[PDB]
Design a protein around this nucleic acid. Structure first.
Length: 37
RNA sequence: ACGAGAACAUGCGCGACAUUCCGAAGAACGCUGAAGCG
């Protein structure tokens, strides 16, 4: 069979794959809550 | 046939000289591209 919809990863201007700090910060805030500067 | 008749309140002269509208000051604080799954 064949694929349908593809979700693209995040890549910076240099063109490399990287996990953004903000996404890690959000996850650690969801876990850690209960200003995170 | 007048305390009168003439008789320029005038002449030369710069509102000018010295001056920083500066001094101090993060456009940053928080913010998962993610939720449901038809």
């Amino acid at each position: 069979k064949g694929m349908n919809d593809l979700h693209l990863f995040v890549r910076d201007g240099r063109g490399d794959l990287y996990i953004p700090g903000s996404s890690l910060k959000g996850a650690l805030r969801t876990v850690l809550e209960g200003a995170f500067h």
